[PDB]
């Protein structure tokens, strides 16, 4: 059964998607659109999360707050990119160019291995060692990221302890005494006639952990607010969001 209110949600606001949410506690799962959250798409940026945490198993950094990226002047899409950086601020304002030089550094061996270990969507590096999450080939769907998120929120990937805590603390969205929300937006826009816009991530409350991803066709920036518009109302909707 299609979640009623997500299925109103979707259809007021007039968007092809789809919508899944992991209520732990419950071990059930809420969804629009069923066929397209079983189907796989680039991450885009969204892959952030998983990089950063495959980049500190294998030590490429110390850990999140050491300084990474040496900004040299060159071409940057946002104004927020235009300095050095470390990977908490790289995820924050998802700094393309910084996560680049981490996938660079890992190289396609210990990629591989990561996505492997991971089991992460298709697990597709092709060879394109820094954009094989933004372009193609790499497809993961909403229902594989609930899957992986849920683990990540409880610390149950096959990854150190203290890395996932890291992936945990630079994904810090919105903390309130009922609720912390951590998360991750993405747009595909490469190498597609329709791109696809993504939010994913977990709202963590005093007993429960609801995982999600929404993705959407969105066309134009002026509509990537929907991604996280959407999530909110149905958190609302069921006073997660409080
Ligand atoms: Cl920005
Ligand atoms: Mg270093
Ligand atoms: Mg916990």
Redesign the pocket.
Same mark, same amino acid.
């Given at each position: 059964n299609e979640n009623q209110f997500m299925k109103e949600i979707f259809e007021r606001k007039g968007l092809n998607g789809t919508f899944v949410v992991y209520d732990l506690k419950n071990d059930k799962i809420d969804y629009y659109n069923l066929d397209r959250a079983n189907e796989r798409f680039y991450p885009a940026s969204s892959f952030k999360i998983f990089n950063t945490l495959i980049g500190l198993e294998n030590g490429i950094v110390k850990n999140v707050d050491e300084m990474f990226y040496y900004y040299d002047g060159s071409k940057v899409f946002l104004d927020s990119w235009a300095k050095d950086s470390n990977l908490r601020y790289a995820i924050k304002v998802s700094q393309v160019p910084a996560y680049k030089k981490l996938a660079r550094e890992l190289g396609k061996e210990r990629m591989q291995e990561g996505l492997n270990k991971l089991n992460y969507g298709n697990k597709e590096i092709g060879s394109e060692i820094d954009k094989f999450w933004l372009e193609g080939p790499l497809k993961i769907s909403a229902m594989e990221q609930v899957k992986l998120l849920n683990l990540l +929120?409880? +610390?149950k990937l096959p990854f150190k302890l203290e890395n996932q805590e890291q992936v945990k603390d630079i994904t810090i969205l919105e903390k309130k005494d009922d609720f912390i929300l951590h998360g991750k937006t993405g747009w595909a826009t490469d190498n597609i006639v329709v791109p696809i816009g993504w939010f994913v991530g977990w709202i963590?409350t005093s007993d429960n952990?609801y995982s999600f991803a929404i993705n959407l066709d969105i066309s134009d920036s002026k509509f990537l607010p929907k991604r996280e518009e959407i999530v909110r109302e149905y958190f609302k909707n069921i006073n997660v969001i409080k």
């Open positions: +929120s409880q +610390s963590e952990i």
